[PDB]
Design brief:
This is Small ribosomal subunit protein uS17. This protein is largely without helices or strands and 81 residues long. The chain has one domain: Nucleic acid-binding proteins (OB fold (Dihydrolipoamide Acetyltransferase, E2P)). The protein is built from no helices and two strands. It has a two-stranded antiparallel sheet with strand order 1-2.
């Protein structure tokens, strides 16, 4: 796959509202090279106070000149569309 990602949250808070999150950095084994662990992306409480939407999806690659929109198709939990 070129880029993108998906997962964590779907909510989270970040003056944005909705999205996901998903750690930050490659991940390797864990040894002790810091890491961070894959990535992460805004969100909020989309009703019910959300609280970590769960595992959705999208993308929103880093801006490289004139591109701030993101990619996706959605996700977050089974049973709901």
């Amino acid at each position: 796959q070129r880029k993108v990602y998906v997962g964590r949250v779907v909510s989270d808070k970040m003056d944005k509202t909705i999205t996901v999150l998903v750690e930050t950095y490659k991940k390797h084994p864990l040894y002790g090279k810091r890491v961070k662990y894959s990535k992460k992306y805004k969100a909020h409480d989309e009703h019910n106070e959300a609280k970590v939407g769960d595992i959705v999806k999208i993308m929103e690659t880093r801006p490289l000149s004139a591109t701030k929109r993101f990619r996706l198709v959605e996700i977050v939990e089974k049973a709901v569309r």
